[PDB]
Nucleic acid binder design. Sequence first.
RNA 1: GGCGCGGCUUCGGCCGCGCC
Length: 628
Amino acid sequence: PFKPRNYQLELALPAMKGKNTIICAPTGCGKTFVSLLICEHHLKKFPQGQKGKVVFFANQIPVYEQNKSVFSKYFERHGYRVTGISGATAENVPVEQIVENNDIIILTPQILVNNLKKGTIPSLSIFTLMIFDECHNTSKQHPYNMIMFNYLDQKLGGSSGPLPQVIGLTASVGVGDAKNTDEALDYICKLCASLDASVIATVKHNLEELEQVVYKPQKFFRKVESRISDKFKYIIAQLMRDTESLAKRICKDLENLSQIQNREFGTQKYEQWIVTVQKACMVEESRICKALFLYTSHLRKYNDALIISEHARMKDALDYLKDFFSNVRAAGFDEIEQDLTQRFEEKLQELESVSRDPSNENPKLEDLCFILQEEYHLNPETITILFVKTRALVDALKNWIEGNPKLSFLKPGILGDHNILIATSVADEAQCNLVILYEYVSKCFLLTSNAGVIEKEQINMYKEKMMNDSILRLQTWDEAVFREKILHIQTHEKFIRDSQEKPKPVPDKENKKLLCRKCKALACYTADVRVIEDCHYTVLGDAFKECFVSRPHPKPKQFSSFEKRAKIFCARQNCSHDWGIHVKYKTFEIPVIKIESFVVEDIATGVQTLYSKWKDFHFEKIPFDPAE
RNA sequence: GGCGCGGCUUCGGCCGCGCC
Ligand SMILES: Nc1ncnc2c1ncn2[C@@H]1O[C@H](COP(=O)(O)OP(=O)(O)O)[C@@H](O)[C@H]1O
Ligand SMILES: [Mg+2]
Ligand SMILES: [Zn+2]
């Protein structure tokens, strides 16, 4: 929409000269505009009586929509036809002819992947230009790389057939698991080879101009020491062991109700354990599961508390708990809750003692405080964003600030104007000169007690430098030499790809059995299992329908050719294991099951085999026929 | 349901972000 910056002009040059190029430029510097310039040029270069055809790949839906609107709006004067296909722009719309009848097409990559496989789009020769957004994803088995495997099979396999020009956009080509500066460079050449790029476009002549429009904060690291003696954790942990023991009383097999393993009190993974346990027990069986929901609620609160105590001050954790229980005994208040609240009360005074103890303060907070003093002394006109781990840590930090004499110059608020200069939050849901990551996940401070976090961070910094040095070096090579290297890397990768064919599994045609992984009851047999479109597995017969119950899906999805309309579970007395889903498929109401919800058992022997994915299950897979 | 990519892994997986 607005007038091109000089670096944008510079970045679009190699592409406009027809070269396959990767445009590597910082986020928000305007690569999409560069792609608009390249696209405009590409379509305009064709003499009257010919046409180009441009395809643009967005890896995600929001990007897809944004660029559909942007490319549509930009190309109105030109009169070019602009449409796009997403997983929703389906399915009774003939894709081949949508490509025939358009000039610019925005695709999610999987769509091209599918139609290429199904033969409905015979060749990428239908395109004259392919633009890959987030092009650093063009590796391994990713959709981008499937598309490029098709390209390269056409280029190398000698089936010509003109090929389209290929350009990619990224903010970072990356280096992978490179340890030295030569492994990094080799990875980069591998990326170029995947995309058939012979040119990497970086800003070289307008650096000092690009610099002015880019958020590149000064990155700082302060490792902070965790609390020396912590007796708050010990007490709360004992409460959690207690209530877990209570929850096991109404649910014997509690330790096996969740897939999540080796939970630790006061961690995020414990929270995740909570969530999976609660979605496994849905509110006669409602009584057991409701009680279970109570226990796991209190366990959730305790987990929260531990985390608060870890990163804020024990007073904050204990306040949080006190308020929670004040809520419980003011909107409850049946036996289990009275019992739980009492068990808390029996420890309340010791917790109370341990909290107000000077030895039990958090030095981490002193560190953060210090950073705030210094920075607001160097510039009191400073706007800060303070990232914390949990919702509760937001409030803990806010109270801590409002009640800290040394920070009486900060007017805080959570997610302006006469007084809000620091905002505490969890996710970003740019105008802030000071960014602080206080135990999370222009200046930027990372504060953590975890040396591993810092280690990884310094590793990523070093990687960035290896990447930049490597690109710089690459760009000095004559294009011919580089194309020759690219050629032979591509030849090599192609050989590996074709040599490492499957081969077809050859099935064990013997009848095996299928039981609910949880309660081991008879679900069905393998001879009763049909495959729908290569990848989906259903079961035949009414005898199977007595073994599952249906229950409306939280989020109905319209995927491929199916219509997910229900979640399905075991029918037993309070198993209710997640078996899979129920779909409307074409005209049929059928169940679709996942192999991870079943134990396979050999009928003759009794041994039990376990399978994560149907890909790994090698049985006489009978193709599904409707009239049965 | 299935696929892809990441982070951990007791290599049994677990989790996260996406896509069809
Ligand atoms: N030359 C320019 N002058 C002013 N604003 C621009 C210019 N180029 C891009 N912008 C704006 O800045 C934003 C950059 O976004 P985008 O180009 O998609 O960034 P990225 O290339 O990192 O994805 C765009 O939304 C655009 O509206
Ligand atoms: Mg972009
Ligand atoms: Zn069951």
